Amino acid sequence: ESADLRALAKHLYDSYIKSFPLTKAKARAILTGKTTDKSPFVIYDMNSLMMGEDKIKKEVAIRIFQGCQFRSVEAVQEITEYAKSIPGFVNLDLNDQVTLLKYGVHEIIYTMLASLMNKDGVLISEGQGFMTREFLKSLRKPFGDFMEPKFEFAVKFNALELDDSDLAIFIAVIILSGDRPGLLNVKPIEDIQDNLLQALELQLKLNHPESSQLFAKLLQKMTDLRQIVTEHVQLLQVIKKTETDMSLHPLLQEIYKDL
Numbered sequence: 001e002s003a004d005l006r007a008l009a010k011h012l013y014d015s016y017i018k019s020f021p022l023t024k025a026k027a028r029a030i031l032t033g034k035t036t037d038k039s040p041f042v043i044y045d046m047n048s049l050m051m052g053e054d055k056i057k058k059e060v061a062i063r064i065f066q067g068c069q070f071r072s073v074e075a076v077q078e079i080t081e082y083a084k085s086i087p088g089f090v091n092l093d094l095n096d097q098v099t100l101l102k103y104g105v106h107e108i109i110y111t112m113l114a115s116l117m118n119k120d121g122v123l124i125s126e127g128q129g130f131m132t133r134e135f136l137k138s139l140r141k142p143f144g145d146f147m148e149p150k151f152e153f154a155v156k157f158n159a160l161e162l163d164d165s166d167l168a169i170f171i172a173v174i175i176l177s178g179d180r181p182g183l184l185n186v187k188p189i190e191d192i193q194d195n196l197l198q199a200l201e202l203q204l205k206l207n208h209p210e211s212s213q214l215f216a217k218l219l220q221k222m223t224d225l226r227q228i229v230t231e232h233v234q235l236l237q238v239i240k241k242t243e244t245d246m247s248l249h250p251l252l253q254e255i256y257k258d259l
């Protein structure tokens with residue numbers, strides 16, 4: 001019954017809206033000058049950056065990057081809340097619950113980070129600010145290209161014109177992989193993903209009828225996400241060696257023992 005797949009698509013969009021304070025609908029409204037929302041203060045340079053403080057709520061490159069870390073630890077909270085709402089996930093082995101989040105969480109962050117980006121920059125502080133791609137290309141030697149490959153993916157991925165109702169199922173298909181390193185019982189996971197994959201395929205067909213093979217085209221973008229993550233990992237172990245005075249959050253440290 002396709003009808004059950006609709007009930008499931010709508011249950012997931014519902015939880016996605018509950019769990020994520022800044023949707024793609026809101027971010028796109030901010031980014032394109034709409035009247036449902038308010039204009040962001042732009043940071044493109046060092047003077048704009050500290051004028052952001054008297055308008056929005058230690059070195060600069062270091063501060064920027066620890067901001068992403070902190071925002072990332074917040075997302076992991078939102079993602080983990082979205083996870084629980086996915087039918088079946090809290091029924092699984094607790095070890096596998098940990099393993100699925102561990103490997104899925106960054107692929108999801110980088111998917112939802114694309115919603116905040118256009119080719120010229122990225123929203124920050126709940127959309128109250130916008131920081132140019134160029135301003136992030138002139139930070140430091142170790143922090144010179146630690147945000148560019150998310151832009152490169154984001155620009156290509158945003159070209160599919162996905163909705164929040166599309167992304168809610170896609171993000172759930174990511175978590176429920178089952179080819180993840182260290183899983184105890186895979187088959188119960190593969191059962192949930194098969195279901196989520198049929199919900200997504202019907203969703204894309206209905207929401208994007210003129211869009212040939214959007215389903216497959218979105219599945220290939222999972223290949224892009226894995227490279228971003230493994231590139232970021234390598235980047236991270238360089239930064240922690242050049243910068244021995246940079247604290248990393250133990251939550252991110254615990255996720256990052258992966259590969």
Ligand SMILES: COc1cccc(C(=O)COc2ccc(C[C@@H]3SC(=O)NC3=O)cc2)c1
Binds near residue numbers: 064113123124125236
């Ligand atoms: C001050 O706040 C700012 C400033 C400038 C840009 C942003 C964006 O929000 C950047 O967006 C990102 C990028 C990467 C991550 C993943 C994290 S960062 C890391 O080193 N390890 C991770 O797992 C999360 C969020 C925020």
Ligand SMILES: CCCCCCCCC(=O)O
Binds near residue numbers: 063064067070
């Ligand atoms: C610029 C460093 C301040 C932390 C980044 C902004 C997040 C807000 C907060 O931590 O209270």
